Design a protein around this nucleic acid. Structure first.
Lengths: 61, 254, 88, 106, 117
RNA sequence: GGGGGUAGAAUUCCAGGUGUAGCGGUGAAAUGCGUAGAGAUCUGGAGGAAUACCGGUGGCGAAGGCGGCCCCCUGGACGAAGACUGACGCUCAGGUGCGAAAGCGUGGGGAGCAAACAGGAUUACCCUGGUAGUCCACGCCGUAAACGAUGUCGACUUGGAGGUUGUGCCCUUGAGGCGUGGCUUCCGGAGCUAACGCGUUAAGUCGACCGCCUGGGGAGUACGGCCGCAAGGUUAAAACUCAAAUGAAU
């Protein structure tokens, strides 16, 4: 799952697309049922990938 | 909405005694209302000139039981007209008083200070917060624009305090009576009064900083040193006479 | 914080051997090392109070250890404060 | 002496002059005893939003062990160079050598 | 004075008015109508009825070019958000897409003093 | 915690396009903006302040407090196994330091908001502009319902539901079983309490040291000292006056 048994890479777009909504926001942990620690890692990875233009900030076009 | 008239009889004896209205003086008591303040005028004045903004009150005010034909009634707003017109009609400065809504009691005296001589003395009852500022002096926290402007025209003397429980639906504030009577001569005359207002407003708009930059939008340090004004004191430390000094200078020079 | 090599060198110098790491002399030396290093950091970042609060703890602990050493043995105390430049 | 991970992307039009950049940077890193544990080129990749009127870019990933000075030098050259549009260096706990999932999927 | 086969409907559904503007791919406007410029005033100016009246008026104002298809962009939370698209497709228009465009800041400037009511 | 870079949304302004007559605001209007083309919609730039989603009843800090991403310098807490010193401890009057917001001094900056001020209305509150200020560097000020209204340290005394963060052992698809630590939220037993309530994170049972209280008003006021550029802070009475003032529950 999201909690890979090691760490969460920020170069894995295929996995990171599971935890974002259509608009590109991050899905809260209530819906996914993921641990808090790995949720924090998720947020950091998604933000980093957003900086490098590997994911959309919102939906400009 | 509801106003709160004066009911207690013990308090309104001092007011009547303090005014001491005799015969031969022009009394212009605005807003009689229920005549709560003119009924204790039963020593009478053989005449009085009354001003009432409401026709309904004026209509059901022309007869009373005894009032009838002693007074002339005007139905225009006091803030609008020329008091001095009714000054050569009789020939003497008018003696007036009122119990107006504190709300509207401020603009009238500044509409009355212009007409000067047509006015001899005044006895109004105002809020305690405001009365203290009027009679205040420098180096306090009750010192302000109102004090300087009023003290430039007339003399301010408190007359009577009204504890809050004297009026029906009594408020949360205390009222007071002050006696003001315009000066016979100006201790410090100023060519243009509006420039004096300009200076005082600008100085007291930054009441908490030094005048080197509070009032430095118009002046310079060496100029204020010329007139002997310390450039490192707050606006509340400047005496009225000093405030008339740069009032004169700003017109004498450019 | 101190590097592991610097800590090991100080321990080897002041200690009885390579495992006596809890003697008063070694502790005072380690604290002095840290203090001397941190003046350089605080010369540049003077507006950083939250770490100056730990530097003060270092200084106070060193003073308490020195007083205990004074009362226990005097000659060792004199030799130590001469060896480290403490108290002029 | 620390481990880093540098990722930078370059103008698609200058996608042919990257070898010189890579060679220069490799020489600079290795000159000061630093090692290189992983070096990858993803080629041209389509951008996810228009970075100042462009689309697509040439992507470079490179894992390094090195001291602070060479990294500051690399940062300064990136800042002063023009063909590079966006770069990012990260510190990492320890060395890695396994290829990115990105290369394998391609 | 020119035939186009695509169009964009923009509505500004504020809390005090509504404005509908028709434009092309490049964003060059064709015709516009306002709820308050259709003989409405006062609270009546914010009612959905004025919105549909302005929608019809603007539709009639853009048939000289022969528009047959467009999609709608909504910008605002106010009333009149939905009546306009209905009155528009009732005037010979096909709705390809419906989009919400109202901006949201990521904590930008500070907002005014809210209604102490 | 200190320093330096950088990104994307939004508001305002500027310059360009398409376009024609209203926009904004209110309970209704007016001041106001516009035919020198507004408002609307698309393209480019300038500048300042703040970091949506994640976000939690979650985490860190002595308290005040701390929120985009990356690097450099740096303080504390916790856990595993082993080694070392040998009472090196606890508390602390005077003293020293840190300390929201507002406010001040010298010099910058100024997009949004907005005391004062300038206008327009209605019978308070409302609407349109808008200065100080909010921001930065360096000094001052030293106060808050600065609150858990609960001083710091140590030991002992039945339980039940949750959250967050380490670690040992077995077989091992392990979110599989048996343990062992730290911090934190809610119920409730004995006991305590005027009651409300607290209840192993005590307001229970004890020991060490410190601060403070003595009917209500006058009064945290006056006079004096110390501190401050100023505003003011701190230490701190009496004459007189009343027979009450107060807390919890019914």
């Amino acid at each position: 799952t999201a909690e890979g048994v090691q760490e969460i890479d920020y170069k894995d777009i295929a996995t990171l697309k599971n935890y974002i909504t259509e608009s590109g926001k991050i899905v809260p942990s209530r819906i996914t049922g993921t641990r808090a620690k790995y949720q924090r890692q998720l947020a950091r990875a998604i933000k980093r990938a957003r900086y490098l233009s590997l994911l959309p900030y919102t939906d400009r076009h | 909405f509801g106003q709160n008239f004066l009911n207690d009889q013990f308090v309104i004896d001092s007011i009547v005694s303090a005014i001491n209205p005799q015969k031969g003086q022009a009394m212009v008591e605005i807003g009689p209302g229920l005549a709560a303040l003119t009924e204790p005028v039963g020593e009478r004045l053989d005449q009085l000139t009354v001003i009432e903004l409401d026709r309904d009150l004026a209509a059901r005010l022309q007869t009373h039981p005894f009032l009838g034909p002693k007074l002339t009634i005007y139905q225009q707003d006091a803030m609008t007209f020329n008091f001095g017109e009714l000054a050569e009609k009789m020939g003497q400065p008018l003696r007036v008083f009122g119990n107006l809504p504190y709300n509207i009691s401020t603009p009238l005296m500044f509409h009355l200070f212009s007409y000067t001589d047509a006015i001899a003395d005044m006895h109004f009852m105002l809020q305690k917060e405001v009365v203290n500022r009027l009679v205040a002096g420098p180096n306090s926290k009750a010192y302000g624009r109102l004090s300087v402007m009023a003290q430039y025209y007339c003399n301010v003397i408190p007359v009577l305090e009204v504890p809050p429980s004297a009026f029906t639906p009594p408020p949360k504030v205390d009222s007071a009576v002050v006696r003001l009577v315009p000066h016979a001569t100006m201790p410090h005359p100023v060519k243009d009064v509006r420039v004096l207002s300009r200076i005082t407003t600008e100085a007291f708009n930054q009441r908490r900083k030094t005048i080197r930059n509070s009032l430095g939008n118009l002046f310079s340090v060496e100029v204020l040193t010329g007139m002997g004004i310390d450039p490192a004191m707050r606006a509340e430390n400047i005496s009225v006479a000093q405030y008339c000094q740069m009032a004169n200078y700003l017109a004498e020079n450019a | 914080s101190l590097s592991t090599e610097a800590t090991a060198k100080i321990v080897s110098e002041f200690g009885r051997d390579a495992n006596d790491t809890g003697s008063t002399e070694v502790q005072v030396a380690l604290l002095t090392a840290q203090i001397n290093h941190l003046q350089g950091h605080f010369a540049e970042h003077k507006k950083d109070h939250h770490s100056r609060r730990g530097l003060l703890r270092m200084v106070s602990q060193r003073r308490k250890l020195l007083d205990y050493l004074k009362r226990k043995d005097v000659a060792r105390y004199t030799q130590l404060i001469e060896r480290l430049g403490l108290r002029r | 002496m620390r481990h880093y991970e540098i990722v930078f992307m370059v103008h698609p039009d200058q996608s042919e002059q990257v070898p010189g950049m890579i060679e220069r940077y490799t020489a600079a890193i290795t000159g000061a005893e630093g090692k290189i544990h992983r070096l990858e080129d993803w080629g041209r990749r389509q951008l996810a939003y228009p970075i100042n009127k462009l689309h697509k870019a040439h992507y470079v990933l490179m894992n390094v062990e090195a001291p602070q000075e060479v990294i500051d030098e690399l940062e300064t050259t990136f800042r002063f160079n023009d063909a590079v549009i966006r770069s990012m260096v990260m510190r990492t706990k320890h060395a890695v050598t396994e290829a990115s999932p990105m290369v394998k999927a391609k | 004075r020119k035939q186009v086969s695509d169009g964009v409907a923009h509505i500004h559904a504020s809390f005090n008015n509504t404005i509908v503007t028709i434009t092309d791919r490049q964003g060059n406007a064709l015709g516009w109508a306002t709820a308050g410029g259709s003989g409405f005033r006062g609270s009546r100016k914010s009612t959905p009825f004025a919105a549909q009246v302005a929608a019809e008026r603007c539709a009639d104002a853009v048939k000289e070019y022969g528009i047959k298809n467009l999609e709608v962009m909504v910008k605002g939370p106010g009333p009149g958000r939905e009546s306009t698209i209905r009155a528009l497709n009732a005037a010979g228009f096909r709705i390809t897409n419906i989009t919400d465009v109202t901006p949201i800041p990521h904590n930008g400037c500070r907002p005014p003093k809210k209604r102490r009511v």
